[PDB]
Amino acid sequence: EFQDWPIVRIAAHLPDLIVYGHFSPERPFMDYFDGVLMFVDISGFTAMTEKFSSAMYMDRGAEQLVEILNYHISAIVEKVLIFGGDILKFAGDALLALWRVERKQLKNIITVVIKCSLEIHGLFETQEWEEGLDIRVKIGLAAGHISMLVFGDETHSHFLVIGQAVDDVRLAQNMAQMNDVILSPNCWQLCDRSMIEIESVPDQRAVKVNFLKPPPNFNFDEFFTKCTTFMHYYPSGEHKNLLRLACTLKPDPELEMSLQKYVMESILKQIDNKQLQGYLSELRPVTIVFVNLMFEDQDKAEEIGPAIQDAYMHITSVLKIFQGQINKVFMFDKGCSFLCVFGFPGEKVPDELTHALECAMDIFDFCSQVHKIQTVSIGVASGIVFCGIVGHTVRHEYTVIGQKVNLAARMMMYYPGIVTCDSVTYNGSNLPAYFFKELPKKVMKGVADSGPLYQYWGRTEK
Numbered sequence: 001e002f003q004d005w006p007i008v009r010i011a012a013h014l015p016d017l018i019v020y021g022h023f024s025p026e027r028p029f030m031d032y033f034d035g036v037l038m039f040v041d042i043s044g045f046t047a048m049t050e051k052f053s054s055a056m057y058m059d060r061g062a063e064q065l066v067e068i069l070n071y072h073i074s075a076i077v078e079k080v081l082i083f084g085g086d087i088l089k090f091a092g093d094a095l096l097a098l099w100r101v102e103r104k105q106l107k108n109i110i111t112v113v114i115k116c117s118l119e120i121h122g123l124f125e126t127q128e129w130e131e132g133l134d135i136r137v138k139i140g141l142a143a144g145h146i147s148m149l150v151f152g153d154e155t156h157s158h159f160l161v162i163g164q165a166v167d168d169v170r171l172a173q174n175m176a177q178m179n180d181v182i183l184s185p186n187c188w189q190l191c192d193r194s195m196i197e198i199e200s201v202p203d204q205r206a207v208k209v210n211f212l213k214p215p216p217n218f219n220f221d222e223f224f225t226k227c228t229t230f231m232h233y234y235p236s237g238e239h240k241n242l243l244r245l246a247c248t249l250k251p252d253p254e255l256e257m258s259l260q261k262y263v264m265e266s267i268l269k270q271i272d273n274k275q276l277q278g279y280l281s282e283l284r285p286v287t288i289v290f291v292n293l294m295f296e297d298q299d300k301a302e303e304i305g306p307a308i309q310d311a312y313m314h315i316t317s318v319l320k321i322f323q324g325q326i327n328k329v330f331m332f333d334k335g336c337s338f339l340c341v342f343g344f345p346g347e348k349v350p351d352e353l354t355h356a357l358e359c360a361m362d363i364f365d366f367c368s369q370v371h372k373i374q375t376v377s378i379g380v381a382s383g384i385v386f387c388g389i390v391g392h393t394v395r396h397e398y399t400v401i402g403q404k405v406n407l408a409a410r411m412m413m414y415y416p417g418i419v420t421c422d423s424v425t426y427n428g429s430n431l432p433a434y435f436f437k438e439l440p441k442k443v444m445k446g447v448a449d450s451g452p453l454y455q456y457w458g459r460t461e462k
């Protein structure tokens with residue numbers, strides 16, 4: 001069976017949530033369901049990202065990083081997919097996975113997901129990044145109600161999952177230390193407590209899994225097989241040994257037209273074999289523009305959707321003018337964030353810095369006027385970042401990785417309500433100093449040395 005069609009290669013960059021969705025053209029589109037989420041990231045990774053920018057790697061740092069990273073990430077992806085999960089998105093060394101099911105099956109599927117988690121940790125026992133640098137992961141799990149949101153224009157689509165279960169899994173994963181599996185309180189409340197031995201987590205209602213102790217007659221393989229009854233797209237029969245049903249997609253112009261809107265043009269070029277398959281693995285100077293839109297705690301997903309759509313329509317028009325791209329969109333704790341980037345796949349202009357600032361101020365001014373958006377915050381950082389397609393052959397995404405990505409991310413959270421930029425952006429800009437304000441230096445998680453940070457005040461006093 002031939003399976004290397006363009007539609008199949010495109011679907012590798014998307015979850016089943018999208019590939020097998022059958023929703024309208026309206027934007028925003030919103031749908032609601034229940035499921036279990038897994039958030040996982042890798043330990044000792046940014047330690048490696050720094051090593052690979054070193055002259056040691058003789059101009060093949062990006063190639064070596066993507067290789068070792070995909071060696072480990074693809075093993076996680078295989079485990080998730082074998083256990084029936086849907087990988088929603090990748091970001092650097094992290095990924096979010098979904099087991100969507102009806103409420104009645106949540107209990108049994110949580111047990112499936114915990115077993116998956118423990119087998120993921122089993123991969124990284126007796127394993128190291130380097131001589132003397134261990135590789136481990138941290139897993140948070142949550143369960144409950146989940147809302148999906150799709151937004152975009154006629155040519156581009158983006159999607160998110162939203163709600164307390166999403167917020168819950170983010171929080172659970174941040175408590176997790178190396179080798180931990182942390183369950184949200186609602187997950188613990190819904191799970192088969194007859195079978196999961198947990199321990200308290202100080203000052204928190206979330207719990208840590210210690211052991212899966214099933215009854216004496218329990219057989220996991222038979223239990224799992226029964227659970228697959230509720231998995232619409234689990235590969236089966238003649239396709240028993242495929243990792244994804246998406247692998248079997250056949251040409252369908254209408255379907256491909258909708259799927260390609262989720263994928264960046266330079267990726268599509270590679271899918272069409274009009275660009276070398278290694279072009280996108282690179283250590284590249286870029287400017288990161290990390291936009292955060294904050295809503296109110298009581299805001300419902302059905303008011304949030306229209307506001308993200310309106311904001312997105314202006315964000316994409318500004319980025320088009322200033323020649324930037326949306327690399328990722330995320331949401332948790334009532335904040336929807338856009339990871340925008342200037343200067344990757346051939347999108348290199350000399351005034352990159354002035355255009356990133358002016359573009360940021362434009363996005364700020366417009367989004368501050370959108371009805372339900374309570375606060376806008378934008379962090380701008382410039383420097384060398386890793387770019388590449390991360391994941392497994394059958395499920396992967398283009399992603400950017402680096403200190404400057406993390407810095408822009410922390411700037412928009414620690415300096416809310418304004419536009420901030422780093423020292424590289426400030427000095428390199430073709431703008432005078434009174435357009436800026438030098439800021440207080442705040443200690444920020446995961447950023448050892450900020451360097452001087454500035455607010456982009458604007459051209460006027462007012």
Ligand SMILES: Cn1cc(Cc2cccs2)c(-c2cc(Cl)nc(N)n2)n1
Binds near residue numbers: 159332
């Ligand atoms: C790798 N990655 C990281 C994130 C942030 C989150 C991590 C835990 C909850 S959210 C996402 C994501 C994906 C989708 Cl589809 N929706 C939303 N809200 N976040 N993916």
Ligand SMILES: [Cl-]
Binds near residue numbers: 250251252255
């Ligand atoms: Cl098809």
Ligand SMILES: [Cl-]
Binds near residue numbers: 403404
């Ligand atoms: Cl870096």
